[PDB]
Amino acid sequence: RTMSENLRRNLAALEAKISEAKTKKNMLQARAKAAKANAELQQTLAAAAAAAAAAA
Amino acid sequence: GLFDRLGRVVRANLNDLVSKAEDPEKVLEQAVIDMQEDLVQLRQAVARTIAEEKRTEQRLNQDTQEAKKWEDRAKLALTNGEENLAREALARKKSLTDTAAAYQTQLAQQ
Amino acid sequence: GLFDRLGRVVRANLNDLVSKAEDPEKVLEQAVIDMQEDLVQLRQAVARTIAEEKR
């Protein structure tokens, strides 16, 4: 009964950090979609400037 | 370097040799075709970034109102004297106020 | 780039080669047919959005 107190605290400390992890997951998955959309845009502007149709 | 200078000579001849293959009548309308479809590609990519500015503003409005729920529950715990449970609610709140500050920074930049 | 410049040359020849296959007499009435049925497709899609404002 001195062990079950230790385990019973360790069990609650785990679920506390699952809750934090799950809130951060949402914010990170948002940032990864935004960054990937901007990468495709900046690649499009480069290829346009490389064709330079207005110089021809 | 000497081999830079030779390189720039031989590279310039080849570029001139192409330039006199360009028929003004055919290439001048193809250039406008290319420049038009470039705008079709660009407009798709822009709209795809607008969709996400719209979408982070929703997430911000959830996590500001979800943190109010956990603040109210912490006060309810302290009026019931259950101070160990009040700490748990405050830990849930802090993680929400820290991520909401990231959405504010992201959204103003977008 | 050099291969952009070659590409725009070879692409422009092919587009001109098509352009002189277009008979003015046949294509000029087909263009109006296409533009008419485009309106039939468009009107169906619009009405389908009106149904939901109503709803």
Swiss-Prot record, chain C:
Annotated compartments: Cell inner membrane
Disruption phenotype: Essential, it cannot be completely disrupted. Cells with very low levels of protein have no ordered thylakoids, are barely green and are non-photosynthetic.
Disulfide bond positions: none
Function statement: Required for thylakoid formation.
Assigned protein family: Belongs to the PspA/Vipp/IM30 family.
Full protein name: Membrane-associated protein Vipp1
Organism: Synechocystis sp. (strain ATCC 27184 / PCC 6803 / Kazusa)
Organism placement in taxonomy: Bacteria, Bacillati, Cyanobacteriota, Cyanophyceae, Synechococcales
Encoding gene (name): vipp1
Residues of the full protein shown: 2 to 56 of 267
